[PDB]
Automatic annotation (TrEMBL):
Function noted in UniProt: Binds to sialic acid-containing receptors on the cell surface, bringing about the attachment of the virus particle to the cell. This attachment induces virion internalization of about two third of the virus particles through clathrin-dependent endocytosis and about one third through a clathrin- and caveolin-independent pathway. Plays a major role in the determination of host range restriction and virulence. Class I viral fusion protein. Binds to sialic acid-containing receptors on the cell surface, bringing about the attachment of the virus particle to the cell. This attachment induces virion internalization either through clathrin-dependent endocytosis or through clathrin- and caveolin-independent pathway. Plays a major role in the determination of host range restriction and virulence. Class I viral fusion protein. Responsible for penetration of the virus into the cell cytoplasm by mediating the fusion of the membrane of the endocytosed virus particle with the endosomal membrane.
Phylogenetic placement of the source organism: Viruses, Riboviria, Orthornavirae, Negarnaviricota, Polyploviricotina
Chain's gene name: HA
Descriptive protein name: Hemagglutinin
Glycosylation sites: N40
Family affiliation: Belongs to the influenza viruses hemagglutinin family.
Location(s), subcellular: Host apical cell membrane; Virion membrane
Disulphide bonds in the chain: C8-C20, C43-C89
UniProt organism field: Influenza A virus (strain swl A/California/04/2009 H1N1)
Length: 214
């Protein structure tokens, strides 16, 4: 039987847009039933990368589980994991954010080089998603990260990419002139994925272990 996403599309569901139920119930499905949404995919405006490929990857699944790949309370001792909410992603009358990601910002006036790895010991492919934040102004860049010229690197045995934030005033969407791009990759059993950043990384909180049908 199908995965019914109710009023969200795949983007909103997989990122954990507050408007979408985390829907951690169906562990297998043959197809996904999506619905549309002003934003209820990407409440914070930006581009979801490799999106069609993801939809395809998630189309037919024989097993599927969400797990806390990087526990919020213990993963980020040197960064602030509590301030990353936005009016663009409201929940219950207040600023919020995606459930499955954490918008890390500076602690005090410092943003140390972050370095976090995960080894896939799940016995199956793990889907990991993250975001890159592109602030609207250099002032906003400093206000969030404190470092002016930053990078993000994400790598595994199968994947390698360096990201550079692009600071610029985009057209206002849901009151945001900044943007957030969303990325993902599949980590093979036994492989390691590493994250490194001096700013601008919307880190994974929850990831997904899965097997595809036939």
């Amino acid at each position: 039987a199908p995965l019914h996403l109710g009023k969200c599309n795949i983007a909103g569901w997989i990122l954990g847009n507050p408007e979408c139920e985390s829907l951690s119930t169906a562990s297998s499905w043959s197809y996904i039933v999506e619905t549309p949404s002003s934003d209820n995919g990407t409440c914070y405006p930006g581009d979801f990368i490799d999106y069609e490929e993801l939809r395809e990857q998630l189309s037919s699944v024989s097993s599927f589980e969400r797990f806390e790949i990087f526990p919020k309370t213990s993963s980020w001792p040197n960064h602030d994991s509590n301030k990353g909410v936005t009016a663009a992603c409201p929940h219950a009358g207040a600023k919020s954010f995606y459930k499955n990601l954490i918008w890390l910002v500076k602690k005090g006036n410092s943003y140390p080089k972050l370095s976090k790895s995960y080894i896939n010991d799940k016995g199956k492919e793990v889907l990991v998603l993250w975001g890159i934040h592109h602030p609207s102004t250099s002032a906003d860049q400093q206000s969030l990260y404190q470092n002016a010229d930053t990078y993000v690197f994400v790598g595994s045995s199968r994947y390698s990419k360096k990201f550079k934030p692009e600071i610029a005033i985009r057209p206002k969407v849901r009151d945001q002139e900044g943007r957030m791009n969303y990325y993902w990759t599949l980590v093979e059993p036994g492989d390691k994925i590493t994250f490194e950043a001096t700013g601008n990384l919307v880190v994974p909180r929850y990831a997904f272990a899965m097997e595809r049908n036939a």
